[PDB]
Amino acid sequence: NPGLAYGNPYS
Amino acid sequence: SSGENLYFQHMPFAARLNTPMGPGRTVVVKGEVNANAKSFNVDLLAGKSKDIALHLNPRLNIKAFVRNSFLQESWGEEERNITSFPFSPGMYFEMIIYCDVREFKVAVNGVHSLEYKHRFKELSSIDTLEINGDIHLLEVRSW
């Protein structure tokens, strides 16, 4: 888990 | 180390990336902008030549998100176009830098913000991350 509160638009 | 706890890390912060840039590489910077911030920067550099392949420089006084490269000891032409300035004083932010074949893509808080066509072409020589300025850094990760 990258721990991204906002998610990743590039995934 | 990716995922190292940077809560008490002094600015400037400098780190060698384990895997350097190339198609598919991702770096994330998580932190908070000081309420009294004027500016900060996140740079991707070629550690040997010290060229800065990507310079990301939010300037809070004018609300401008400046991007440039420092190649052969000279700054290039700045890129400043933005749909909106995505930082604010006191805010938590997540900035994601994704390296594609022809350009970097940069997202702030989960939303695509800009593209930056590669000027430094030898992507796997880009092996160093430097961060400085008026922020509280919490964590850097790369994959």
For tokens 């593209």, name the residue: B115
Which CATH number does B1-143 carry? 2.60.120.200
Is B115 an interface residue toward A (CB < 8 Å)? no
Is B91 an interface residue toward A (CB < 8 Å)? no
DSSP state of B9: P
d(CA B68, CA B76): 6
Nearest-CA distance B73 → chain A (Å): 32
Of B117, B106, B140, B104, nearest to B18 (Cα)?
Answer: B140
What is the chain A residue with the closest CA to B142? A2
Task: Count Cβ atoms within 10 A of the Cβ of residue B77 and give its class: 0-12 exposed, 13-18 middle, 19 or more buried.
Answer: exposed
Beta-bridged to residue B70, according to DSSP, are B52, B75
Task: Count Cβ atoms within 10 A of the Cβ of residue B30 and give its class: 0-12 exposed, 13-18 middle, 19 or more buried.
Answer: buried
Q: Pairing state of beta strands B92-99 and B74-75? A: unpaired
Do residues B58 and B67 make contact, with C-beta atoms less than 8 angstroms apart? no
Using CA atoms, how far residue B2 sits from B22, B69, B82, B109, B114, in Å, is 17, 25, 29, 19, 24
> Residue ranges of the domains in chain B?
1-143
DSSP state of B92: E
Task: Count Cβ atoms within 10 A of the Cβ of residue B19 and give its class: 0-12 exposed, 13-18 middle, 19 or more buried.
Answer: middle
d(CA B143, CA B58): 24
Experimentally, how was this structure solved?
X-ray
B143 to A2: CB separation less than 8 angstroms, yes or no: yes
